[PDB]
Amino acid sequence: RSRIFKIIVIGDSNVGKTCLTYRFCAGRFPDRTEATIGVDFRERAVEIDGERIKIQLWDTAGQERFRKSMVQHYYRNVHAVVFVYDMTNMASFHSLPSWIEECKQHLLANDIPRILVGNKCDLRSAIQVPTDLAQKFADTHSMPLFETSAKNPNDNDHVEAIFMTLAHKLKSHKP
Amino acid sequence: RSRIFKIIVIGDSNVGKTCLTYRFCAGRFPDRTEATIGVDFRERAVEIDGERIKIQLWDTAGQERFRKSMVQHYYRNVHAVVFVYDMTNMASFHSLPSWIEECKQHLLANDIPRILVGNKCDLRSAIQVPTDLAQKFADTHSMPLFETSAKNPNDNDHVEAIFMTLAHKLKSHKP
Amino acid sequence: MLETNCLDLRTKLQDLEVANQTLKDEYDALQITFTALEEKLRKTTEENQELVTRWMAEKAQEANRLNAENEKDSRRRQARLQKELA
Amino acid sequence: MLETNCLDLRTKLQDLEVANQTLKDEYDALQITFTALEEKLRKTTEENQELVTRWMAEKAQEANRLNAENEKDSRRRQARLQKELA
Ligand SMILES: Nc1nc2c(ncn2[C@@H]2O[C@H](COP(=O)(O)OP(=O)(O)O)[C@@H](O)[C@H]2O)c(=O)[nH]1
Ligand SMILES: Nc1nc2c(ncn2[C@@H]2O[C@H](COP(=O)(O)OP(=O)(O)O)[C@@H](O)[C@H]2O)c(=O)[nH]1
Ligand SMILES: [Mg+2]
Ligand SMILES: [Mg+2]
């Protein structure tokens, strides 16, 4: 009965993709991370409306040399796309159009949910990407916006609530 | 439910440990090999005198930088030790005393069988290690000697026969 | 010497020397170690490339395998749910 | 020249003194390019060691796990052997 949702996590290096996915699946912050090479798979079983769902996150690599051959695999039978930037790094935010173009060039269906996540919202004195800017980007691309913190998982939009919201949407096939 | 025999394979780089172990577990010569990093594990289920046994081969690394802090793990609860040299490479045969010294300094019981395998017996026009030398070495160290070929597995001592014999002795607790 | 003379030719037999203890000799004596260092660098770089390429290949095979497992399980769910109509 | 005069000696001198600063410049232009190549090799060797260290760390965790799983299986099996000698 346990059906699987493949969810890929896309974005520049060091925006915190590894920390986000690990926070959601393991429920803690990494002692240490290194450059993600190829991809990392993290899985968590939850229950929505009595159904057992396996949320399967693909923490992709952001460096070209570390994602070289992998994009076809990333995008094969993907159920949802999570785009991620660093709220303290405007360049990570300006990268998003090219990530979206890669996505649009490789999706195999027109009905795959995409969402936008700003990470490291705990670092308020160093934030470079204002909410309203991010919000307009998200709205005009048909993505909900979340501002979150893998480090402090209850700040602003809860890391838990993000992936659970997405999982609910997928399970019910709702907008 | 089945008994596992852990059997480790030790010897210089390029003597054919990967090819030997793969030949035994998969029944084929490898298309390509690369330097073994850390260790590779290959398993094969066999039936000996009516019992289902999992033969678990540890194809270890022979390069210093690829076996750093592994040796404790190689030797933990090991059931048998297979030493390997290249019959076409005399230096690999002269390395055996240091490998054996490592084994002796790391074994935790005095009743673990050890065997000696010269590989690449198919390359007869290039053999550097005469049979009688190796035989004397093996006799004086209480190891049986096998001369074999992972590439041509029915030449001289059959690969299958080597590992099956070892497994037979383990199961029987016989000399 | 406030007023140099011919004996100051010592400088010549003192300058034809110092220079030679390096220049054309040292040029090749650094060319050798430089080409050697070039070779070391290309070896190391080549090695990083093989390591990275190998790691990437194993990740691609694992990703392929997982996609195939997901696909199998999905067909299982489809079949079961087909049983749920008849 | 069959008999050297001072003109020949002098033009020899000026020519050697030109070749000298030429080879000097060619030396100075490589005495530090060597330092840079040194730095590059250092960095690349560093990346090399990081890659290998991380690979070896994963292999060590995997070997440890396998030994633990083997031991688990063994004690499981010998637990079966005690619930039959009842
Ligand atoms: N302050 C803060 N730092 C974070 C957060 N998430 C990740 N980081 C840090 O950002 C760096 C990159 O994280 P990582 O997960 O490796 O980024 P990735 O390359 O996108 O996977 C690491 O030093 C993390 O500790 C967060 O929510 N808050
Ligand atoms: N001719 C011949 N070549 C072999 C044999 N076994 C291994 N080789 C070759 O020896 C090389 C190294 O083999 P490998 O298994 O990777 O050595 P390892 O480092 O000890 O694991 C490869 O080129 C193999 O094809 C054999 O029985 N005969
Ligand atoms: Mg990372
Ligand atoms: Mg090998």
Author numbering:
A (entry chain B), B (entry chain A): 30 to 204
C (entry chain D), D (entry chain C): 140 to 225
Q: Which text from the study accompanies this structure?
A:
Autophagosome formation is a fundamental process in macroautophagy/autophagy, a conserved self-eating mechanism in all eukaryotes, which requires the conjugating ATG (autophagy related) protein complex, ATG12–ATG5-ATG16L1 and lipidated MAP1LC3/LC3 (microtubule associated protein 1 light chain 3). Here, we demonstrated that RAB33B plays a key role in recruiting the ATG16L1 complex to phagophores during starvation-induced autophagy. Crystal structures of RAB33B bound to the coiled-coil domain (CCD) of ATG16L1 revealed the recognition mechanism between RAB33B and ATG16L1. ATG16L1 is a novel RAB-binding protein (RBP) that can induce RAB proteins to adopt active conformation without nucleotide exchange.
